[PDB]
Amino acid sequence: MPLDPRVEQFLAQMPLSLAEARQQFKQGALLLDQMVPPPPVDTEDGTVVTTHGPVRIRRYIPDRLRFSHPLVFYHGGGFVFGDIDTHHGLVARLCQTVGATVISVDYSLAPEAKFPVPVAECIDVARWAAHEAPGWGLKPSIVVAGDSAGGNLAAVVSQRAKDESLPIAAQLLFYPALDMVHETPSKRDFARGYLLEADAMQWFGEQYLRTPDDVSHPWASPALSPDLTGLPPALVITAEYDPLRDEGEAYAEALRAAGVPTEQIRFDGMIHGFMTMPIFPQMEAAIEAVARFLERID
């Protein structure tokens, strides 16, 4: 399918230290939010006590509460970049469109924190949210969500949920990374020039993982897990022109064949990252997909 016209324009107009790289990622996110402002939304900042230390969160409160489970959202950024502010544009929209309370998580970034620290943190925050939910007038079962690296975290937290006595009603994976071991056709075909590139992904892995062998750990590569039965209902959204497409779609197929209610949606013409890029109308289409999917959970 052709590249979406606006995406192609974006790619064509694209043109240091860790601190500087983090600042540049943050600047890019600000620029997109200036171009397409987020909806106003009530928020409350907080801190959750995890097994690896305090983790800052931001709770988003919808104008009209319509969904009966809290969402817990884990931002992307290759495990190295991003924060609550970089993903505010997405989370504000998820909150208001779904009509859901959302907890946006500022998990610890690599290389300062290495695998599997953010996984532990993300479980801890999920458990916290499940415990608070009745006092917010909600069901204790949570929905986990995230984009890219954050989709990895959501997928891993979902695989660990039963063992961690964590009630999870659904998982929403937005172009997640799921298999750090295997090359797929999309990983070859779209390796360079589509925003998320091969060299960056290598570098992210070097920052996050402790040693090369960690690539085969199921908490790094959740697609390697042989038993997907009984996992939470899954929405898996992919971009057509994304190196991570094929592993995301293969995981969706695997979930479906394991009896997990699964909705698999590829946005044609799109690239990695599109759900934090509000210049593309497909971002809001995908958020509508989330709302429609979550309507079916109860």
Side-chain angles (χ1 to χ4, degrees):
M1 218 101 353
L3 202 56
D4 166 81
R6 191 62 171 267
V7 164
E8 193 222 347
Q9 285 168 339
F10 170 77
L11 288 172
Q13 259 204 301
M14 297 211 329
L16 23 69
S17 77
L18 178 62
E20 279 165 343
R22 278 186 174 142
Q23 196 56 52
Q24 178 180 296
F25 183 90
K26 173 145 211 171
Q27 286 313 298
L30 183 54
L31 194 102
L32 285 174
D33 287 344
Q34 286 163 344
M35 295 185 61
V36 186
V41 62
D42 289 354
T43 65
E44 294 287 5
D45 289 350
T47 297
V48 174
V49 163
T50 84
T51 54
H52 288 270
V55 167
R56 282 179 187 174
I57 62 113
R58 185 178 300 160
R59 176 167 52 96
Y60 287 65
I61 306 92
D63 285 9
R64 178 75 168 175
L65 183 59
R66 282 206 347 166
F67 184 62
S68 70
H69 309 255
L71 265 65
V72 176
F73 180 87
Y74 311 124
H75 70 82
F79 304 99
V80 176
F81 303 141
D83 63 27
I84 288 160
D85 289 322
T86 64
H87 279 66
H88 179 70
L90 175 55
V91 170
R93 289 172 173 86
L94 285 172
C95 169
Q96 295 285 31
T97 296
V98 176
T101 303
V102 189
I103 310 299
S104 189
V105 184
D106 237 23
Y107 61 81
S108 297
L109 299 177
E112 297 89 339
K114 296 233 159 209
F115 172 78
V117 165
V119 177
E121 290 179 340
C122 287
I123 289 164
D124 290 338
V125 173
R127 182 185 286 110
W128 172 80
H131 175 277
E132 293 303 289
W136 296 326
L138 303 168
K139 294 182 177 180
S141 59
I142 65 166
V143 174
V144 292
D147 63 304
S148 200
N152 174 275
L153 292 165
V156 171
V157 168
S158 294
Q159 291 189 359
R160 292 183 63 188
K162 283 192 178 157
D163 294 335
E164 291 298 334
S165 306
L166 172 58
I168 303 196
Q171 57 185 307
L172 317 171
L173 311 187
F174 314 139
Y175 37 89
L178 299 170
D179 182 343
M180 295 188 191
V181 175
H182 296 112
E183 211 194 25
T184 61
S186 64
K187 246 157 158 144
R188 293 175 313 125
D189 295 346
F190 312 127
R192 296 218 225 155
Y194 305 94
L195 187 55
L196 179 59
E197 303 210 342
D199 284 3
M201 278 180 304
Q202 171 66 29
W203 183 82
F204 290 142
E206 292 169 357
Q207 303 317 297
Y208 177 48
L209 302 183
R210 302 168 298 184
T211 67
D213 316 298
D214 281 345
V215 290
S216 56
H217 191 296
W219 297 354
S221 292
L224 298 184
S225 294
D227 183 11
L228 305 184
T229 69
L231 292 178
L235 175 63
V236 182
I237 291 173
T238 55
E240 181 171 17
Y241 292 114
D242 174 358
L244 299 180
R245 185 192 65 182
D246 285 347
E247 69 201 65
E249 298 180 357
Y251 189 58
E253 301 306 65
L255 286 165
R256 203 190 344 113
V260 178
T262 302
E263 175 158 51
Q264 179 275 302
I265 310 182
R266 179 195 294 189
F267 282 78
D268 310 291
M270 303 305 302
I271 56 167
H272 196 81
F274 76 94
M275 286 174 75
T276 57
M277 295 176 78
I279 56 169
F280 309 133
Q282 292 85 349
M283 170 174 174
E284 286 196 343
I287 294 164
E288 291 291 343
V290 169
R292 293 175 183 253
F293 176 87
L294 290 182
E295 280 180 359
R296 295 191 300 258
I297 287 306
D298 313 285

